[PDB]
Amino acid sequence: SLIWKRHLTLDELNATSDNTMVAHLGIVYTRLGDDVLEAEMPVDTRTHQPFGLLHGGASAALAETLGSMAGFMMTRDGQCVVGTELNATHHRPVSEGKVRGVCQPLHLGRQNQSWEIVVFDEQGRRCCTCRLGTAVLG
Amino acid sequence: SLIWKRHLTLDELNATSDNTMVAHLGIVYTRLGDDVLEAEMPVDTRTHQPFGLLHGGASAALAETLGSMAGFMMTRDGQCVVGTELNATHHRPVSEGKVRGVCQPLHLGRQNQSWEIVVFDEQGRRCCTCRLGTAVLG
């Protein structure tokens, strides 16, 4: 079932990243279903931590990016959304290729929402589990 | 697939609650699958907050109870687990009847573990989403 209130295309979605942290990290929206939003991010110099692994901060940023956008797509003209609470558990390390974030809703209220964001490595293994709470300012 | 390393019956599981907070709140283990554990808890004077609704602290207690026991059945003679990090998002209110918590693994490590616990009201509606990290000692 389609849940989105705002109907946009991937090209339009990616156009919002221009000149923001999203583009600075190479995050690209890659899939938009009826009730799910996906984006991929590279594991290189821009998202690395000392030893060469994926920085725990990059995964967090990817999650915050997806939850905010999905939340936005659930609002109507004149409304706005803002990320209020974030938590994340780092299960496994990643050192090469790209990771893929999958965002799905857990609760959709008219005043606030809760989104799940699981991050997988190119082998399909879950490397990070996050949850983001948002507030609608509409 | 069977994940448990300790094999116990629901009868044995409930017997461990004697003289603990689990029994004090009337929590009962109600289902044990290959890779899942469930328990139910009453929504009454024992678990209410001053305004007559289910106390968020009770939902949190049900979750820590579930993740801890599942963590325990994941260890062998001599070893032990301990809850280290817990978070919870309260989505919807409940005031009567009972709630049901469903616990499943997110990550099973030789040293760490991460468990998902979702709590539903009698209508099958999600009322709270939690995640508990646990450490395995030995």
Curated annotation (Swiss-Prot), chains A, B:
The active site is at residue 64. GO terms for biological process: enterobactin biosynthetic process. Gene3D superfamilies: Hotdog Thioesterase. Changing residue 49 to N: 290-fold decrease in activity toward salicylyl-CoA. GO terms for molecular function: 1,4-dihydroxy-2-naphthoyl-CoA thioesterase activity; acyl-CoA hydrolase activity; hydrolase activity, acting on ester bonds; identical protein binding; thiolester hydrolase activity. It comes from the Bacteria. It is found in: Cytoplasm. Induction: Induced by iron starvation. Its EC number is 3.1.2.-. Disulfide bonds: none annotated. Pathway: Siderophore biosynthesis; enterobactin biosynthesis. Keywords: Cytoplasm, Hydrolase. The keyword Hydrolase applies. GO terms for cellular component: cytosol. Changing residue 49 to A: Loss of activity. Substrate binds at residues 49, 55-56, 83, 90-93. Changing residue 55 to A: 229-fold decrease in activity toward salicylyl-CoA. Loss of activity toward benzoyl-CoA. It is an enzyme of class 3 (hydrolase). Changing residue 65 to S: 13-fold decrease in activity toward salicylyl-CoA. NCBIfam families: PRK10254.1, unchar_dom_1. Belongs to the thioesterase PaaI family. Homotetramer. Dimer of dimers. Interacts specifically with the aryl carrier protein (ArCP) domain of EntB. Required for optimal enterobactin synthesis. Acts as a proofreading enzyme that prevents EntB misacylation by hydrolyzing the thioester bound existing between EntB and wrongly charged molecules. Displays esterase activity toward a wide range of substrates, including acyl-CoAs and aryl-CoAs. This is Proofreading thioesterase EntH. It comes from Escherichia coli (strain K12).
